[PDB]
Amino acid sequence: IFKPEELRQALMPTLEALYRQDPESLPFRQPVDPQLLGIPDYFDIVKNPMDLSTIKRKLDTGQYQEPWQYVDDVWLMFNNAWLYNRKTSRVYKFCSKLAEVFEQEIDPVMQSLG
Numbered sequence: 001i002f003k004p005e006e007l008r009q010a011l012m013p014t015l016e017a018l019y020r021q022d023p024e025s026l027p028f029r030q031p032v033d034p035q036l037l038g039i040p041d042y043f044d045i046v047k048n049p050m051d052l053s054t055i056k057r058k059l060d061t062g063q064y065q066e067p068w069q070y071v072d073d074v075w076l077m078f079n080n081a082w083l084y085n086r087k088t089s090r091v092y093k094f095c096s097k098l099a100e101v102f103e104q105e106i107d108p109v110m111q112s113l114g
């Protein structure tokens with residue numbers, strides 16, 4: 001019911017808005033590498049990692065048939081971050097900032113969709 005190119009053009013601005021957040025999006029632009037980051041328990045806690053680069057691939061290549069599937073992956077990324085990091089930590093605080101930006105942008109777009 002959703003033309004993949006129309007869904008892509010409708011949702012991509014909201015993804016670009018997260019990328020644009022600097023420094024807040026820096027921890028989210030690529031999949032968490034627990035070896036490089038010295039957090040070897042990460043994958044034990046986070047069973048379904050998600051990040052901006054994986055969402056972009058799926059949005060670019062028509063792997064979201066419905067808008068809610070895009071939104072679910074965005075919130076998966078946020079929930080992983082809030083789950084793994086302490087509420088006072090950098091990554092936790094950057095996550096809440098990104099969730100604020102995302103919520104403001106997505107609701108009009110979801111309204112204009114469906």
Ligand SMILES: CC(=O)Nc1cc(NC(=O)c2ccco2)cc(C(=O)Nc2cccc3nnc(C)cc23)c1
Nearest residue numbers: 023026027028030032033037039080081084085091
């Ligand atoms: C690795 C990489 O490629 N990029 C990168 C860049 C920056 N840089 C700034 O944050 C910055 C620089 C200047 C101002 O701010 C920070 C991090 C980072 O802290 N990652 C994480 C550590 C621990 C737990 C995490 N849990 N979940 C997530 C999603 C990410 C985590 C990673």
